[PDB]
Amino acid sequence: KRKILITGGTGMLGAYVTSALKDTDYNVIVTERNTLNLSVPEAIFSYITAEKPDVILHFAAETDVDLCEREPARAGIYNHLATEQIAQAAKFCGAWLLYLSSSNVFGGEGKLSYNELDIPLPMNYYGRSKLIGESSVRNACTNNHLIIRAGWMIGGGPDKDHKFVGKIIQQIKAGSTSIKAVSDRLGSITSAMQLCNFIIWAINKRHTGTLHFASSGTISRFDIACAIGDLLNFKGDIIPVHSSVFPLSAPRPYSEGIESIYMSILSDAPKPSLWKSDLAKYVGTFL
Amino acid sequence: SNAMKRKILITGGTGMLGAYVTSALKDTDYNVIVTERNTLNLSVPEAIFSYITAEKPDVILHFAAETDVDLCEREPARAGIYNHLATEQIAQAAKFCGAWLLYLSSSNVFGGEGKLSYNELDIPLPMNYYGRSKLIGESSVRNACTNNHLIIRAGWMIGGGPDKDHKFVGKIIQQIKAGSTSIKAVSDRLGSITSAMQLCNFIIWAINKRHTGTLHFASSGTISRFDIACAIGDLLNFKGDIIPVHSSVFPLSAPRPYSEGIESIYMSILSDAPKPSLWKSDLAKYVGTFL
Amino acid sequence: SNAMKRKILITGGTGMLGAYVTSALKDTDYNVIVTERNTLNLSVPEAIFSYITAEKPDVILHFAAETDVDLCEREPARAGIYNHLATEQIAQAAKFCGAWLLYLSSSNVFGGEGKLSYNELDIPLPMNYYGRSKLIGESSVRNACTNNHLIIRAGWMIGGGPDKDHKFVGKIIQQIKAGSTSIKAVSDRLGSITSAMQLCNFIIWAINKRHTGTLHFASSGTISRFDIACAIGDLLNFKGDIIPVHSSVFPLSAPRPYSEGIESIYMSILSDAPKPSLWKSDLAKYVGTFL
Amino acid sequence: KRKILITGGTGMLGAYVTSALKDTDYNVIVTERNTLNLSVPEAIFSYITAEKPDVILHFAAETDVDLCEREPARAGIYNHLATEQIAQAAKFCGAWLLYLSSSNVFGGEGKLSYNELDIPLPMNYYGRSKLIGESSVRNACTNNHLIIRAGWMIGGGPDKDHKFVGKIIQQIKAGSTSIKAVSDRLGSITSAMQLCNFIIWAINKRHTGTLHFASSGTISRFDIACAIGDLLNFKGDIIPVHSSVFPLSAPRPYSEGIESIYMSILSDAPKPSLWKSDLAKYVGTFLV
Amino acid sequence: KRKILITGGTGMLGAYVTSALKDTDYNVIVTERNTLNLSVPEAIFSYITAEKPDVILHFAAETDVDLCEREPARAGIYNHLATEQIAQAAKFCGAWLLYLSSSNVFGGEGKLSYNELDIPLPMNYYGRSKLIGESSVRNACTNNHLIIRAGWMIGGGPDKDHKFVGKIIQQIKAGSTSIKAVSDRLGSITSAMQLCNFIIWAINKRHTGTLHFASSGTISRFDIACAIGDLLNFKGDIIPVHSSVFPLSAPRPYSEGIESIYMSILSDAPKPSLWKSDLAKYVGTFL
Amino acid sequence: MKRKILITGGTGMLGAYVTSALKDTDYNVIVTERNTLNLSVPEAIFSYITAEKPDVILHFAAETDVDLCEREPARAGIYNHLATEQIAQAAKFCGAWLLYLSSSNVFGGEGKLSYNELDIPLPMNYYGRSKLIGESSVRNACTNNHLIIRAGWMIGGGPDKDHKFVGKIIQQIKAGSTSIKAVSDRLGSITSAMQLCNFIIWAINKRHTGTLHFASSGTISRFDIACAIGDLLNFKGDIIPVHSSVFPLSAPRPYSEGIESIYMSILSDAPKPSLWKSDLAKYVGTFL
């Protein structure tokens, strides 16, 4: 009975993957605070090696970009040091390791979109911590790992989405007359449900390498808010604003847009589509 | 006898913007002198000062320029002579006869910084010879006619209609009308559009008020040519594919910035001036003149 | 003494620097006009030229400005109107009157280059809208009053307290006096301090001589806000903690450079002009007025 | 009998190396369409591991810089993914792996010349694809690989040279009134025949690490055209032009010039010389 | 007895370490020009493997930053090629390897300070040679190495200190009327004696990873000269000058200051303190 | 009454040639001296020049020691900026046509290989900045009655007065030196002082105005110049290319300060420069 060990299983993407794995023959182990804690990297190696998993899905991370900037030690411990121990454990167990990374490894060059050939050059501590986390993974598990870079993640549905999409929908449904959205920072959206489907396919094929997974289109939060407004027949105003209006601890690049040049050779794989279409399917689940 | 009419002297009177202006001026009290090759030629800057000063215009609208960005990169001498040296003579002539001078400039004075949008407080840093030539032309205007000039920076100009538009919009429309199976449009270079007809209306207002200083005149929105092609496609019920491509598939001589988008922080204080609107609405009105 | 009654017109007369200058001018024989909102308002630049030309002053001290750096980044229209457009009208008025114009500028015109300090030969390259607005204001002043203006760039200003110090130094002193026992101060932002009292002394001297050009006026030393906070603490017998933090801990609207330190290469040839000294000494003198 | 497996064996350099290995005791396998294709990296590992070579010479690559920029997927599949599978196979077999890379891994910094201590920072997709290829070779074959970075390759002679030097000579022998050459893009030349001689030596020594192999000098195509013109007593005009007069899909750096700080250590290795001397020797093969 | 092999044992740091190891149970082998020469990297692997050390302390390097810029071949051979051979030998023997690196791997970005998450981007050939040296250590000794980045090293005392601090003290004692010190290049100081104490602790814990070890504070040579002046009651003038006054072959960044986000988690390890307390203790050893 | 030409830096290398060329004219030439004008005392310039009432001002005096300017920016400022500003204000008052000799050093910060008159100055050091701000002073005060000429690496003096790069290379060759070292990784353009003198005389008579780059065609290194001189003088020793790092200096130097002109061709009858090798050979011929 093939074993899968999952970190961040109660996270948004993790919950989808954990649920999808229930109708399979895998023995799934969802780590908890008492068995695996990113703040205690020294206890990770012994735990994972004793479990002897065949597959490791490493989704746990410190994703508060601003907290990472104020407390780079936390970004480092949680995203770099803990990942290194997981990578060393994976290598010792001979386990295939999936590492969820981020479009934030890019931004420093200042161009509009980055593909798998672009050399990462981060703009903040979150991105740096994820980048060194990737290095740890590909050095320890060279021919047996998969690194997936996601953009701005959308997922959770009405009951669990407390991120951008859920917030914009909340404001519309509460009868707000004007909603402000940043128009001078660009990125790409990644549907968590879609990514989940891809991951299930990747586990079964034991796909390896580095891949960018995001809907096509380089857009702003303002563009996204406007699209949501159209879908819900919003009557108020969506106001485009500059970043300066909402000061934040971490610098954000002009764009963290990502596209893939390698997704198309994955013949049977579940793939993303156009951002508006993928956003519309997700927004539809709010009824 | 009746009083002498105020005189307007226009360069580039048969260009996209110039044609709208010359036409709108027919319904005014102004006497309009539309320069031609036989009176004013940008390639003969040395004859400009004598010609303009003898005409003694009250207003000078300087729209003529070498606007082929790629030609300017291959032949910077042409860019310099046409956009800088000629403009210097026009500004000196404006100063000498006391004329209010309007200089049409470009969002291409920006780009080297690499940000998404620029307002009138941003300091120009061009990316190519066309932009450099326009920027130094601006300096010539400011230095000579300090308290009596208006510099307007326009972005990607749309205008001309079915008969005259052979720029981006006209070409996309021609491909749609020809039933092209697919149209490619660059997705990784951004800018702002400027409706020539709206700019014309603003210019008529500006001449009447003698507004001075530097302004950015463009529709709201920082978009790509791909975004524009998609919007035109929707307006004309195009059923072929509109394909986003990177700038590498269409090699060009002149470097283009990631963005030359422009916005204004000063247009709102001109309470009764005709203003641009949202890019999609302004584009829709223009595309409507084709069908 | 002087057979004619000469006039000084001051903007920002109640500000930190302005209040010292105004008090100092009471001893002189100049007719001093201290503008107020009813006669000159930066938000109404269109009324400035006629007002100043009617006063026909011999000297104009232009200290008024929108100096909230973060507000300027959020509302660049306000920075533009108050610091650029209003200044342009003042400069045109000074030129019309033959008045010597003193313009207070800022170390914030620098920062984009990323080096540790800047002198008068360094070419301004700002990092935010406040800095751009002051720089463009400087251009207005030079292009209008070339052989009859003085631009002084000041760094982080100290002075006027406890009643008028509302800047960085005043805020640290205020927290200590309020009984705070733990004060955070940014260790990754470097700059130079300028004593307002001292700068006032220099200005009185500059008015008399009608000194012209561009000059940096700041105490010697490029230091961090943390270094300054520790120095203030010592001077005030503070026994609590001064905690050094990174700029990420205090998110702000406007980007700030690694350093806006300024030094002067021209102050030393100004023989008997009052000059600044070492930052710690100048800070001590000022704190010595509180105690 | 030691087995050598060569990719790109029918390319210009590959053909020289294949030919030079004929009078050796090696069993040489030159891959073909029926056994290995850069377009199908998914079939490489099984094939190479089944052959169990002792040495792998990886010369095949997508070298059309402009095509790489328009189609980064092709640059990535051919130069990155294929190279990764070749490196994994070499590691599995315990084979010494030679990877031919490029000066184009540099250029982003904008300086005039780069040595082996300079950190690669590419300017275009071709350069990025070669660099990521080098990383695959280093993450898989530590202590058993040789990465050679070549500059502007010259080779082929009057029958096979259709690159810059061949075209200049063609225009000169056709009696053209003028020749235009870009003067504001700099680089270094690498003699293919010299590089081949060095490679034979490296195979025999199983030399390892990263090395820059190019004639000494950072020069423009204009400099090169002018040099060829003197050698052939050309009487037309050689006109220097800016790169802007020839628009291309891929950006090029102000310089991709490379020099070596480690070549002189290899006492007995065949080495390049000065660019003008190396170019004169190559141009001489077109006379007769 | 476990065997410790040391390169650069007669250097500033090497001498403090060599002496501190005499009061321990290790068999210490101090390499010298007859057994290991950085200029002869070809002889290193055979010698180290024959010795079979359990621990390797690699402190030897070409540290003349300006010489490195003029002769990058020397920088490469001594700091990269030799380090590559030492790393391969360490892997072959299963030896824990400690590599002394430098703050000079940073500087190209132009910011005021760098922590362990910052991606190295050197400004000169010395820095590049040290960085490529670090890469060799990581690629070869995956999970069994410690890389310590030090700043401006202070140590040696009255008889051996001929570096920055020593020179300032000499000018003070000679009664110079004025001392010039560069005010526009910043960095961080590292007390050699303290670093020695940390190294002894690291050897015994076999601590691994990459760590920055320097006193707290980003300062200039001028700040340091002023602090020494105060400590020695110097009556002359300490003049802040721009770096142009002292032309040097190697470019120096605006700052090479380093700080650590990981030192704090090492509970019982000997730590550095504030730059003035640490400088004062060292200056105290001159009188 | 004769038209008056007032010259600063008249005893300098370029200034001395212009002064001699003007002896064969109807101009009343006034060469400034310590008793009338000093760059160190800008405060005394305006009263002097306005009392003198020149019709033409040739402003050649400057602090050109680039490294000294970096160590002592106050000197660079006073001499090149403040003095120039006072001269510009005096020219404006007198209605005099003002010639200001500037430098390619106003460029370099961008890091490209060559700069024309449309490129926006962005200097690399204090010397460059001081010259640039001096230029602004000249434009802002004499808009329609000034000429700013930017020269590159100046060559001139001959066997008696040349103690700069060319002169030093020639002394080493005639002395039979074993080797000569020259920097290969810093580029620029050469300007013939004699050709510039001829151009200046033409410009004075035409009262030509604006900004113009005056230099021989070609972006080259000191090493290229040294090698060309060696060929001309049949030198048989070694000419070794070295990196700029072997000669540390106070002022940063750009990868290139090369300048070219896009406006020199429209000045039909003006004396112009030619190719760098031709212009160099002619200069080198004055030493034989």
Ligand SMILES: OC[C@@]1(O)OC[C@@H](O)[C@@H](O)[C@@H]1O
């Ligand atoms: O040119 C630098 C480099 O590419 O070559 C030497 C190798 O050891 C690599 O680590 C390094 O990145």
Ligand SMILES: OC[C@@]1(O)OC[C@@H](O)[C@@H](O)[C@@H]1O
């Ligand atoms: O044949 C030489 C050359 O300079 O001619 C002009 C262009 O075709 C260039 O690509 C080419 O290298």
Ligand SMILES: OC[C@@]1(O)OC[C@@H](O)[C@@H](O)[C@@H]1O
């Ligand atoms: O004589 C020429 C030269 O290359 O010699 C060595 C150094 O003195 C250089 O400054 C100088 O230009």
Ligand SMILES: [Cl-]
């Ligand atoms: Cl168009």
